[PDB]
C-alpha cells in the first residue's frame, strides 16, 4: 500500500541526499546555481586546487548532478538534475 | 561565507541521507509525535526505530520531550523542515 510508495520516494530522495553531503561537492553545486564557470574561475572563488577540482568534478558527472559544455580548450560546468537546481536554489535562500 | 555555509548544510543533509531517519523527519514535520505514533504510522516497532530516532537525536534535529512515561518528538530546524517541505513537493 502506501508503505511502498513512501519508502521507494524516500530511497530516491535519500540517493541526491548522498551525492550533495559533501562540503567540496556542494560548495561547487551552490556556484553554479543559475549560471556556468570554467575550471579557472571555479578553483579561484573557492581556492581548491585544479587536482582537488577535477576530483569532484568528475565525481559530480558521475552522479549527474553537472554537465559541461565545451569551447577553445575553455570548458564550462553547469547543474544538470531539476532535483538538484531545486535544493539549491533552497538552500541558496536559506543562507543569503 | 562559502565554507561557513556548505558545512552547516552538510551536517543537515547528512542526518537526512538515510531512508530510516528520512521517514521520520518526514512524519515530525509539523507534527509532533509519539514513538507509538511513528511506530504505527511507519509500521515499524520500537526498536526498528530506536537507532533512527537516537541518531536524529545526538544532531539535534529532534528534540525529546517527556511526559507520563511517554516520550514525544518534534522536529528542531527550521532548514530541515523547509527542505522535507521541498523534498514532498519533489518525490510526490
Do not use: F, P
Not at 1 to 17: F, H, I, R, T, W
Request: hydrophobic fraction near 45%; glycine fraction near 2%; charge should be positive.
Amino acid at each position: 500500500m502506501n508503505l511502498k510508495d513512501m519508502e521507494q520516494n524516500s530511497a530516491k530522495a535519500v540517493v541526491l541526499l548522498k551525492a550533495m553531503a559533501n562540503e567540496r561537492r556542494l560548495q561547487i553545486l551552490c556556484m553554479l546555481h543559475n549560471q556556468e564557470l570554467s575550471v579557472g574561475e571555479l578553483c579561484a572563488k573557492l581556492q581548491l586546487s585544479q587536482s582537488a577540482l577535477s576530483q569532484h568534478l568528475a565525481w559530480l558527472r558521475r552522479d549527474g548532478l553537472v554537465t559541461t559544455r565545451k569551447e577553445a580548450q575553455t570548458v564550462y560546468y553547469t547543474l544538470k538534475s531539476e532535483e538538484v537546481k531545486a535544493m539549491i536554489k533552497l538552500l541558496h535562500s536559506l543562507y543569503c
